[PDB]
Design a protein around this ligand. Structure first.
Ligand SMILES: *[C@@H]1O[C@H](CO)[C@@H](O)[C@H](O)[C@H]1NC(C)=O
Ligand SMILES: [Ca+2]
Length: 395
């Protein structure tokens, strides 16, 4: 009923104070693509307040009845920012039993030692003034407003028109639900990029593509390795050495060599764990160790030392691994022999193969490893990057 669109997070409306003194019943429907946003705020005397907000895609109901801030997490199997309509029901009875109903799932919670809820400010819907965020209750996570569609707002036998009954409107607000008209299709992002739906369009996660730009169509950061060999080393701050159950690696390359090491991830001294991306007999492959036997996975059918650009993508889950060159079928490997799951205490990323006795010659582009765009960081002179030998940035 009467959908209204908040086109930006910063947009909100202010209605007359919600009266929820001895009991409360709120209902509304929402539709959004964003993970975070303040949907509803009303404060009162002393520390009294209510808040409804999305946090990481989940509906949170935060409140203070006068004896301390409390949080109820609405129950859902999925995050709710899926561009689908969701029903939200929030009630409080006279004994202070709260109920939160998100679609079909019910969550209940009682507050002991509380009396009544004394709300006094206007009721803010969609967000608040930008300078209000800094004096929000500590338990409230929102630093920005809600973006999306609200409909059927029921404040307990009070059915306001969010536009006509508003005492104040801020920013871009319309009647109707103006959802995204350009939605994520299979070919929205190039080069196997992951399409992420936004409110006014889409963006692309290019992490595993070796490419950059808004559509994963632009060349990634590139270095060239020439005569004599070179090396780019990333060393983790000794305290921030990660240990992982799952690894993700992507890089683009061009070369004519039939033997070389491109990337090696090593654990610190006295530990045997490592991850190695290499070319053997003109075929790209990965060898790794997470505590027992070496595990090898190879694309044995694609000859990749033709001097043409290629993309390689590697995933590890415990002992399990996948490898894919370009658009060839994905290679899967499930270990022979017994295995552990953690890649312990990762200390260095060595790019160029010189120290491993297999120097790389050619170009490397858009290296990504567990959140780290390593070649980008080298280009931006990160303090944990060391570059030696015959290596240069393709500017
Ligand atoms: C590896 O693969 C097996 C078989 O599909 C699966 O059951 C297991 O959970 C996987 N292990 C890890 C650590 O992902
Ligand atoms: Ca290990």
């Amino acid at each position: 009923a009467d959908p209204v669109t908040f086109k930006t997070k910063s947009s909100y409306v202010a209605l007359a104070t919600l009266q929820a003194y001895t009991s409360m019943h709120l209902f509304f429907q929402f539709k959004t693509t964003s993970l975070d946003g303040l949907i509803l705020y009303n404060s009162g005397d002393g520390n009294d307040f209510i808040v409804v907000e999305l946090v990481k895609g989940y509906l949170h109901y935060v409140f203070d009845l006068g004896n301390g801030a409390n949080l109820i997490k609405g129950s859902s199997n999925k995050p709710l920012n899926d561009n689908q309509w969701h029903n939200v029901m929030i009630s409080r009875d006279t004994s202070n039993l709260h109920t939160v109903k998100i679609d079909t799932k019910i969550t209940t919670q009682i507050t002991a030692g509380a009396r009544n809820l004394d709300l006094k400010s206007d009721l803010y819907i969609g967000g608040v003034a930008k300078e209000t965020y800094k004096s929000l209750p500590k338990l409230v996570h929102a630093k920005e407003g809600f973006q999306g569609c609200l409909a059927s707002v029921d404040l307990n036998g009070r059915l306001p028109d969010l536009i006509s009954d508003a005492l104040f409107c801020n920013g871009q607000i319309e009647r109707g639900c103006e959802g995204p008209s350009t939605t994520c299709q299979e070919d929205s992002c190039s080069n196997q990029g992951v399409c992420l739906q936004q409110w006014d369009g889409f963006s692309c996660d290019c992490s595993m593509t070796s490419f950059s730009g808004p559509l994963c169509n632009d060349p990634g950061t590139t270095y060239i390795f020439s005569k004599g060999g070179g090396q780019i080393t990333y060393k983790w701050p000794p305290n921030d050495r990660p240990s992982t159950r799952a690894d993700r690696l992507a890089i683009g390359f061009s070369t004519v060599q039939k033997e070389a090491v491109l990337v090696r991830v090593d654990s610190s001294s006295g530990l045997g764990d490592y991850l190695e991306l290499h070319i053997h007999q003109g075929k790209i492959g990965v060898k790794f160790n997470v505590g027992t036997d070496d595990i090898a996975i190879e694309e044995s059918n694609a000859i990749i030392n033709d001097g043409k650009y290629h993309v390689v993508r590697f995933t590890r889950s415990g002992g399990n691994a996948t490898l894919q060159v370009d658009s060839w079928p994905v290679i899967e490997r499930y270990p022979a022999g017994r295995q552990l799951t953690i890649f312990n205490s990762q200390a260095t990323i060595i790019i160029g193969g010189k120290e491993q006795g297999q120097p790389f010659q050619g170009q490397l582009s858009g290296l990504y490893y567990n959140g780290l765009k390593v070649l980008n960081m080298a280009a931006e002179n990160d303090a944990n990057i060391a570059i030696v030998g015959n290596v240069r940035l393709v500017g």
